[PDB]
Subunit: 314 residues, 3 copies
């Protein structure tokens, strides 16, 4: 599998700025090295340099819209470039708002992509439904074609064009969804597997249906947006919006192992890892370690084992 | 959903007296407020004042029988009253012995009720089978019609009349059952799902069968007696009789979310929460928080989300 | 059920010597007493005294081959003796290398035995595939008939005769398998349920298939080799090779409860418990406690309860 690593040290989609350290701690944990330890072809396109936009007052309640909108616009470009290089874009980012540019850039090359959004949240608040104003909780609303007409023209996002339909996305792990967000869920008929469905069906059936749902009619490129708060904070504590009762370490690896096995993974986001929020140096390493393990699984690392195409017994 | 809150600060069903603080810490955690934050109609009937019965020597091995028997008799009355007010009785109690009065009072109004008992124990010891003498581990024996004839006339329980049949109760979560208790299980043919069955079937199937079992022939009012030690102590540590290998936070919420969805919940007990037993201030908050989350789920709070009947996108 | 307890304080199959304390801490936790508390017939054949083999240089990369080979040869003899006494051999050991002698001795009496290997590892490295040289990670390679011809004549194992076929063994819990080990897995067609399969099917189906797999054609004696690192280190931290994402306390007990229920358990190993590796006195007790609970389950202790064949209500 050939990857296109892209560091995205951004945080203006939410209050806490430690998420910008994401690319740093992840790379320093040997991610690139570990990918190469596998049969992975890796090209690191570096960390995107997000220049400061000192003048960026709120748009109504929406915070740092110009900074956010510009970082996603830039990202979208780098992603598109890697997708043109015939590589799977791996976005080691800051907050989840970056998803807007990652998915957008991906769709430019493969407009028929299907999205898997693992998160404890749906992040589909509109600028009028969000109560926090944090954009890392509204990325999905900017992308849905069905929602084009409700989203106001927010400074910094003029370049955006909704690229995915409500039927081309599956949510897995939900356990903290706002009222307006849930209204949108049921109204647009979005397919989701909240923690209740996971508990009911088991992660195997959940993944079986998710993949059947998105790859029913035909095979299409898959984009996986992975918010680390989708996993229980007993696994990923150094994250800004933890919610108890999350997916287990195992369920996290099962999800990714199944996605990889599709052979259709083409876009991947690893978001919301914030070292600064770790209560102890071990919570940080535990969060980073869990984050790396999930990434390796997306590119082939299997729990049952791996082996090159040779005769080990000779 | 309309609730009838009833505080039951009682502890004489067992040794440790910190359980009496149950109503206090639960209410102070905003339970009433959080219920109102939902579409819940709440009337708090206050904390029942249990006067001291200084003269209450053991009956054979059975401890504090008069104190226990009187608190359940009183409770039964308050429950019946709330059930007559057309409200779902919510009993924030002390020890599980109170179940005797809660279920009894409930049955007075709805004699056809079905019982779901979530606990790590079966609490069906008779005064002759119990080895500890603690009544919080014998409540079920006073209620079963099938057992009427074996239970001795214990001071304080003359007012009791067995109200439920062995076939109108399901156990979920069992992992610490005494020999005589197990003998009673198999002999009366009581339906139960111990941790082994949960592991075997999954919580979804367990709940599917539990509800099919109790609501097969017809729909009937449901009484949920929830002992917090049914959940693993990694979730509810501040409890008197913890047993490892318990139901998860998720399984706990799944159970309740499914019960609520029946629309038949009419009686609820939240028992054995003892702040005094928390090893740290966080074990207390973790136990209380888990206790509140389970209660909210019984009245509609869903992990996938909630929304009023309006147009959020306008 | 009648047991034949055998202490095996050995550690030369790996670096750390604290595993030799296994028999000691296990017995001192009341294991023999607790077995008797059940309807178990127990005869403790004592702790095998492994004399020092001061002169034992590496064989290529393989470490302490003579010490290891001799301890398994001795063990095999004691096991065979207990199996001749019509008792179920219970091997409280040190490292997993001892499996070589336990299974070998067992097969002498019941050559048709079936093996269940619960571990986070496959321990099927050959002296030429192992990279660590630690024999506790190669035991399975000495036993497989299919592998006879690749394994070099290692000092200390001249007495060995491969006793099991690749089709008479099931692995459960795998999550850290070496490349050569995985090559062997797929090539010999060994049946296994890694953590991925557990996640996919559930432990109930996994056990259903494992037992159907080994007891399909006919009923045969079952040998359970239980490496405590098969369970998540949140349960068994005092172990030499911990790997996160392991089987839960519940899954561990479910496995054993199901094996016991077969009535065919005839050989049992409880390996890799190392007190010296516990970060705190509680990690040690937690590891030992978990180890005892699993053993009791193999001999009848059920979570739903137990009761003698009498009338408890009289
Ligand atoms: N729904 C909340 C929290 C969303 C959290 C964003 B996320 O999932 O990216 O961490 C909000 O709108 O602020
Ligand atoms: N079976 C034990 C323990 C029962 C625990 C009571 B419970 O479930 O309410 O906490 C006894 O009879 O003392
Ligand atoms: N595969 C590694 C680790 C095996 C661990 C051995 B065991 O499972 O017994 O703990 C090795 O060969 O050194
Ligand atoms: Co999130
Ligand atoms: Co998110
Ligand atoms: Co209990
Ligand atoms: Co109870
Ligand atoms: Co192992
Ligand atoms: Co092993």
């Amino acid at each position: 599998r050939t990857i296109g690593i892209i560091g995205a040290p951004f945080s203006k989609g939410q209050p806490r700025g430690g998420v910008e350290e994401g690319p740093t701690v992840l790379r320093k944990a040997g991610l690139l090295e570990k990918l190469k330890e596998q049969e992975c072809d890796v090209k690191d396109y570096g960390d995107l340099p997000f220049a400061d936009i000192p003048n960026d007052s709120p748009f109504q309640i929406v915070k740092n819209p110009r900074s956010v909108g510009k970082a996603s616009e830039q990202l979208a470009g780098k992603v598109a470039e890697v997708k043109k290089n015939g590589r799977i874009s791996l976005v080691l980012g800051g907050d989840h708002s970056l998803a807007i540019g990652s998915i957008s850039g991906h769709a430019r090359v493969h407009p028929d992509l299907g999205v898997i959004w693992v998160d404890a949240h749906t992040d589909i608040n509109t600028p009028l439904t969000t109560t926090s104003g944090n954009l890392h909780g509204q990325p999905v609303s900017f992308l849905l074609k069905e929602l084009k007409g409700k989203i106001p023209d927010v400074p910094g996002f003029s370049w955006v064009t909704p690229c995915i339909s409500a039927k081309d996305i599956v949510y897995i792990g939900l356990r903290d969804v706002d009222p307006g967000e849930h209204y949108i869920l049921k109204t647009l008929g979005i397919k989701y597997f909240s923690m209740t469905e996971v508990d009911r069906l088991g992660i195997g059936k959940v993944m079986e249906e998710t993949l059947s749902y998105l790859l029913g009619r035909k095979k299409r490129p898959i984009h996986l947006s992975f918010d680390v708060d989708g996993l229980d904070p007993s696994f990923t504590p150094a994250t800004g919006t933890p919610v108890v009762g999350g997916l287990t370490y195992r369920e996290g690896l099962y999800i990714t192992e199944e996605i990889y096995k599709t052979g259709l993974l083409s876009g991947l986001d690893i978001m919301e890892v914030n070292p600064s929020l770790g209560k102890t140096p071990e919570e940080v390493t535990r969060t980073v370690n869990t984050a790396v393990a999930i990434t390796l699984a997306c590119f082939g690392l299997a729990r049952e084992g791996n082996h090159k195409p040779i005769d080990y017994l000779n």
